[PDB]
Amino acid sequence: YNYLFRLFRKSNLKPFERDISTEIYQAGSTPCNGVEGFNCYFPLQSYGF
């Protein structure tokens, strides 16, 4: 689990753009206020190789 990828973002990267921000993604009708919750998720995932 020492390797990760980003599953969620506001928009696609431009070519050679890079992003290490950890803002919670709002997936739907309820805003997140800086924490995970109902319709609210941390943007990174791990492969578990």
Binding footprint of another protein on the chain (CB under 8 A): 14-21
Query: Would you put residue 33 in left (φ > 0), alpha (ψ -120 to 50) or beta?
Result: left
User: Smaller CB distance to another protein: residue 1 or 10?
Assistant: 10
User: Smaller CB distance to another protein: residue 19 or 36?
Assistant: 19
Taking Cα atoms as reference points, which of 14, 11, 46 lies closest to residue 23? 11
31 alpha carbon, distance to own chain's centre:
14
User: Smaller CB distance to another protein: residue 34 or 48?
Assistant: 34
CB of 15 to another protein, least distance (A): 5
